[PDB]
Amino acid sequence: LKARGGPKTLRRTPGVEPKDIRVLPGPLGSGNFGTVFRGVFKGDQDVVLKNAKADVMAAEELLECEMDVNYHVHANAKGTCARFMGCIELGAKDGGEIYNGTLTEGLWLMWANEGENTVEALMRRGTAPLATAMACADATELGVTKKAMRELLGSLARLHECGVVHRDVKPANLIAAEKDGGVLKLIDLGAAALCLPLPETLNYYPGDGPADPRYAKADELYLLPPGSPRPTKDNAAKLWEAHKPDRFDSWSAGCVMLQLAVVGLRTDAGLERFLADYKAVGYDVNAFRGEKSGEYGTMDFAALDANGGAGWDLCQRLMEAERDARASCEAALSHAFFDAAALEHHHHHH
Amino acid sequence: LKARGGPKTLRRTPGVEPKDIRVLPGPLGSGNFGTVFRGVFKGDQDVVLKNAKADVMAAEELLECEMDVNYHVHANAKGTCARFMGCIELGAKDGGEIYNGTLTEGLWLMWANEGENTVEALMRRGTAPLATAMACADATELGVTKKAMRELLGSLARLHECGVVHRDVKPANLIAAEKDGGVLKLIDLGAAALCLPLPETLNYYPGDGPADPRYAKADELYLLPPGSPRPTKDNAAKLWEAHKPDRFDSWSAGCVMLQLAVVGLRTDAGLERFLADYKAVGYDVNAFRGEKSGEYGTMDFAALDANGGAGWDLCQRLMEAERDARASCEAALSHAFFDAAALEHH
């Protein structure tokens, strides 16, 4: 006798058919376990498409987790991240060729194209183009830092509230969404963890990595430190309070703040130099100011200096050496840095 | 009192200076731990350049190990891999911009550009363009499989002899070098281990490590099993014999052979299907042929069937479930599959 075989099963999102997706050749970035392409959906919708790298161990599992977290965020934290449009799974015979503009065999994720420029690209062109893209009236380092950080910290607080730690916060993963007033949206949940049993934790484990070493604290490349009881439904809440994995994002947000606030820190080399001196003085912002800032004559810390050094203090809060001392993104939101000035806008007010 | 500054120490290769190198925009790799670009050295030498990804944990350390292994291979197994032209290290102030043709900050490795096409790209275009690139006179599946596997196994044997296990053998990491008769050369020693103390082992440790899930044996993603002692200069030889880490490459070479020999196995899904069935029948090639091959009506296994199933037998040896049963690349090289034709009547 012979084995009967049977049909293939393919994952799909209602209203999203592969025939309606044209993929544009040319990856949008090196990528972690996946590759991102521009596409056009139904002839006139600009989208971004991601599949797994064939050469990376368990990339399909990582893409599945990214998919799961994206569904979670879509349901619980709308507007924090790029709009998630679902998945499309293609088989072998129906799989196409990127050069022919068709989706290849395997699982794909799709999002709205939120804009052609990241905060990293904009900030490096200058504060002016960054402010314009952000629709930020105060086109100064202080102005863009206030507006961007309010948006970023607000979104991170909302993500943390539904149990999601992004784990890859940085200017490169922020887009000023021109179709939503220039508001910042996060992209790339490929490293994100769901840290509460809602209903099951995802991508949540003890140990280092993944982490962008530019934006993760050098001796804190983990969400959970190794050894600690692996995350289960039982201990999830306890681990959250004890190990504070969300504070991983706090540190990264502090890095975002430094780069927004200080032009000279917008290069990898600039931020690296600062963080090295910061560490050297015991992660003490005032000690940096007292001992080191004098060696930064090519830079301008005015945005951090302003209003009694409010920005410096917010940086200190977000970038405390110890997680037990480090501000949550939610707490960081109520900081004086975000206060309206006395009588602000008085000259035009009704 | 203020702490004094001092010089920055940079690594350099004699004969290779920053002003000698122009980088061309457009990355070539899948971009895991490093980024690869084409470049031009001294105005008219085509080269390839690799730097560490700034956004990946331990990227520079991974590149440093790839550098060390490249020097070892350059010294001990010339011709097995792309020609290694050394390194160039640059500082931040002293770094440029890729889109402006200049090397950016950090360590860079440089190799000769060995050719524009990998075996993965060629085989997927077809046996004909693959054979042409290989200067392979017998432009059939059997012909390209014989020539390619002789070259690949010969090179792996030479690497193994000097203690190197490549650990990323696959068609995407083979280039047909037109300038050298079309011979296949390995690229990408980024996952490689030095398994002998010369003077120390490199990237060699117990347990799972880097692997391409298509080309590494799924239940065998290690060079040394998880229970193995850490390698030392004193036990390295014992561990080599006991755990046969080179047999990791043997399995991958078997996968290469399957794709060269059978057109339908050249897609990822094709080879994945075969390996699933192969595992299901106990890693037994004859059981595959008897129980499973009838399900593969769209494929042609003639190259493996030929000459008493010589190809199938060589695959079986390269792909035994147990390392202790699996052929070394050196032993495989002497297989009947590579025998000269008798009585050719010239």
Ligand SMILES: Nc1ncnc2c1ncn2[C@@H]1O[C@H](COP(=O)(O)OP(=O)(O)O)[C@@H](O)[C@H]1O
């Ligand atoms: N929803 C989106 N809208 C617009 N651009 C996007 C979106 N998602 C991702 N991108 C762009 O795709 C690129 C993907 O790069 P990525 O996969 O992050 O690799 P890397 O981290 O090496 O840059 C990024 O430059 C990003 O700006």
Ligand SMILES: Nc1ncnc2c1ncn2[C@@H]1O[C@H](COP(=O)(O)OP(=O)(O)O)[C@@H](O)[C@H]1O
């Ligand atoms: N010496 C070389 N000559 C020609 N092309 C090369 C050479 N080395 C690498 N390449 C090309 O660059 C790509 C990436 O190089 P590789 O070392 O395989 O890094 P990775 O696979 O990690 O991206 C290869 O797939 C190949 O196309």
Ligand SMILES: [Mg+2]
């Ligand atoms: Mg990314």
Ligand SMILES: [Mg+2]
């Ligand atoms: Mg695949």
Ligand SMILES: [Mg+2]
């Ligand atoms: Mg490679």
